Amino acid sequence: RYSLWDCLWILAAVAVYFADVGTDVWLAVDYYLRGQRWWFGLTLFFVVLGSLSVQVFSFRWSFCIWLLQSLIHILQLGQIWRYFHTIYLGIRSRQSGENDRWRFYWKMVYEYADVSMLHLLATFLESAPQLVLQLCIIVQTHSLQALQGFTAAASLVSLAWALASYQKALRDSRDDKKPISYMAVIIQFCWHFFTIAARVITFALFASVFQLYFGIFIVLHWCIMTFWIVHCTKWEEIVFDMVVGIIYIFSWFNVKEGRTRCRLFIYYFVILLENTALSALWYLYKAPQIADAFAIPALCVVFSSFLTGVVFMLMYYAFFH
């Protein structure tokens, strides 16, 4: 019920977030040793947006010295400050503090919910565009340096970890809704990781094939998902539905809403149909120039990863109850 002991997994969230941002900013090679104006500009823009939106939202939520210290700490590493503040609140609750339930450790749960929400925002403003852009660059110019691969993997693990952690916080920071344990959080992270991996690989392949049609596809998918969600606090509901529609481009937001099997099946069918269409079109439009006889593994790995992601999702869905 209380007295948190597994703070190591919360510390691992700090490691994952810092690894993501550090690997993303390590792409200064695209401007210093391997100077590329477009790639450096895109990566820097994504990193700046992801690391400034979260900072602004954290600032938007004891003399003037403390105010200045917290302001500087925000401006530099606000998200990591939130993580270590969560750790400190948990430690203080464990040590003592048998006061009213006002601030016993619900302060820690509130802080964890806020930091997971900020992590999700940063992961869908920085990690997802960074991952897709890096995959598109890898497939556009076939030079998969270990730095690019590690940065893409860091963005992917940040995205999947953000999804799993947000689901944990949502199941944690409210009454009822039985809390989800790390044994299920890791499985959800794995299925998000694999499904998003397949999705972004297909996105990169179809982008290299015809990015002009890929942009129309992405806006059409966002519009369709937004319309589906609004089909299922006056304009704030519409804004939240549009945000969930943006989330639906890559992964599945997992709105419980009672029965969810039908919506999950429809979303999986839509994404599988889109991925199959993109893979088939790219394969039909990859023969000229470089006729890759090894492109068959390049399409089989995507479908194997997608199948493993679906299998992990089914395993979590079945074993949670």
Side-chain angles (χ1 to χ4, degrees), residues 3-4 6-30 35-36 38-39 41-70 72-91 93-97 100-102 104-106 108-143 145-147 149-176 179-189 191-208 211-212 214-255 257-288 290-291 293 295-321:
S3 184
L4 50 102
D6 298 75
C7 192
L8 291 85
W9 279 263
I10 297 95
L11 189 57
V14 203
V16 165
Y17 184 91
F18 188 70
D20 169 38
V21 294
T23 47
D24 295 7
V25 303
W26 201 354
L27 260 294
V29 187
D30 281 358
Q36 294 287 347
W38 291 90
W39 299 354
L42 266 303
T43 46
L44 183 143
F45 177 87
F46 289 140
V47 174
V48 162
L49 175 59
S51 179
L52 283 191
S53 60
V54 59
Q55 240 66 287
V56 170
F57 273 70
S58 194
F59 222 161
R60 198 81 169 180
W61 35 49
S62 184
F63 249 79
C64 300
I65 296 183
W66 272 54
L67 176 74
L68 176 59
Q69 162 189 163
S70 62
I72 283 183
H73 204 154
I74 286 303
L75 167 66
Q76 294 181 170
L77 336 98
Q79 182 74 358
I80 104 171
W81 161 247
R82 292 298 183 101
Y83 277 111
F84 292 119
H85 192 356
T86 315
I87 299 173
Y88 159 58
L89 291 169
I91 294 297
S93 173
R94 203 180 189 273
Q95 295 174 358
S96 65
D100 300 79
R101 43 161 180 80
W102 185 0
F104 175 54
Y105 85 104
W106 172 258
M108 121 82 180
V109 167
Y110 191 117
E111 186 61 278
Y112 180 46
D114 198 357
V115 73
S116 72
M117 176 184 311
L118 291 180
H119 190 6
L120 193 62
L121 175 69
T123 230
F124 276 108
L125 293 188
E126 181 188 17
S127 293
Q130 275 285 351
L131 168 70
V132 173
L133 192 264
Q134 291 315 116
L135 264 305
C136 174
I137 287 181
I138 290 177
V139 303
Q140 195 82 202
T141 58
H142 217 337
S143 302
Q145 303 291 344
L147 218 192
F150 273 147
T151 291
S155 295
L156 229 182
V157 67
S158 174
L159 219 172
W161 177 265
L163 265 302
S165 299
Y166 175 84
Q167 289 301 328
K168 174 180 178 56
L170 181 51
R171 279 302 197 96
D172 193 10
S173 74
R174 203 57 81 107
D175 198 13
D176 295 329
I180 168 180
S181 291
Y182 296 94
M183 298 183 303
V185 175
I186 54 190
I187 297 181
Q188 184 164 186
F189 154 81
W191 96 246
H192 278 281
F193 176 65
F194 286 137
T195 296
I196 297 173
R199 194 68 202 265
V200 301
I201 295 178
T202 44
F203 278 179
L205 296 177
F206 191 69
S208 60
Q211 40 204 177
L212 176 60
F214 174 65
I216 296 178
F217 163 81
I218 212 67
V219 300
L220 173 64
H221 188 200
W222 167 70
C223 178
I224 289 299
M225 285 310 163
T226 298
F227 212 172
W228 179 33
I229 296 163
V230 304
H231 177 208
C232 296
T233 63
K234 184 173 299 301
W235 306 125
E236 191 63 31
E237 258 290 346
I238 295 302
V239 175
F240 180 50
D241 293 332
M242 293 182 178
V243 164
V244 178
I246 298 182
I247 291 182
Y248 270 17
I249 296 181
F250 307 97
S251 63
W252 150 259
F253 191 67
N254 193 16
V255 279
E257 307 187 20
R259 185 61 68 187
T260 182
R261 182 174 54 256
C262 58
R263 289 180 299 276
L264 230 175
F265 191 96
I266 294 306
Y267 179 61
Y268 273 4
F269 170 82
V270 170
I271 64 174
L272 179 67
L273 229 300
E274 293 173 351
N275 287 343
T276 299
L278 303 195
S279 302
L281 209 54
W282 178 81
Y283 160 74
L284 200 58
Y285 284 78
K286 64 104 184 65
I290 302 178
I296 290 89
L299 262 41
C300 189
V301 170
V302 183
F303 291 155
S304 293
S305 67
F306 201 107
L307 189 57
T308 50
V310 170
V311 162
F312 266 145
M313 156 265 176
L314 259 90
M315 284 306 302
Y316 160 59
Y317 181 87
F319 192 76
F320 180 81
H321 188 187

